[PDB]
Design a protein around this ligand. Sequence first.
Ligand code: NI
Length: 341
Amino acid sequence: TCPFYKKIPGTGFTVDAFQYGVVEGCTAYFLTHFHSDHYAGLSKHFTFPVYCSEITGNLLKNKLHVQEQYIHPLPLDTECIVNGVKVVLLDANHCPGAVMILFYLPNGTVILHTGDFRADPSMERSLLADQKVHMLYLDTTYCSPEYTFPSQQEVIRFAINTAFEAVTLNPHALVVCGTYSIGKEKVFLAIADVLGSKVGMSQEKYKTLQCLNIPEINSLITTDMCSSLVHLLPMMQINFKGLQSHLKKCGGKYNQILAFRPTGWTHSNKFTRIADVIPQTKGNISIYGIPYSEHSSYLEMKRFVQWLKPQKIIPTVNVGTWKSRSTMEKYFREWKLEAGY
Ligand code: NI
């Protein structure tokens, strides 16, 4: 049974609600982005209309084989009418194709659903600037003040400088980057670019990347592993055994691996600056955990919400425990009292 925080009142609409069977009274199913916890239940046998971005629609068609007749892609930043209701899709600054959705209810209520997002001050000059929002369905992933991490720009600067230094010292070092979903593509693209290489990967991952409208992509990726000195592997393989085994397969082309695990937040963020991050090393293998987040930090979240001044907030993440729920509701009230709405 579909939970309440996935239904939009006064509409026939649900958001990221594909794992509950046919939802009573749902006439349109919105998908905010192509991450498995959100698309869970879509497949080629789905026969209701799906509304989403062009990119998300590319992945539904090619990866999950959803039939074209049920995929309704919408352009960003454009007022659109769905089943008698005005909607706008906005960039969520999450993974490729990820959107927030503004719903203009027939009774005059305005609702913003963030999907997954990383709040940014640039959002204060989108189409959100122009009108009041009554209800906010908020990505509360890191809604607590211990959740700090650097900008994405700082993290990429660290990774490029690290990779470039290592490979310039040793031209026989291989760089490996972990992945388990879309998002965070800048990590491996930035490093390949500084090294003058293409990124090598499996056919299945290359296929996924060909759906994402990245400019000049045919210039940056390849399935020819032998022509590439940046390789992508599944995240699960980014450990000493997995990497040793990979290094065996490269046929004595390489004698060292430098590997990156982009995580979200880890507790080593409570102590160590990005500048000061160090790898775990065993022999000729080193592994760096880097905190590349595609969700709001606590401070970025707070600033967006205090700018927006919603009358009601409904969290969409960390909803399963009373302690989590109580924690979030305390922060929302602090924010409201400090800013005066
Ligand atoms: Ni996500």
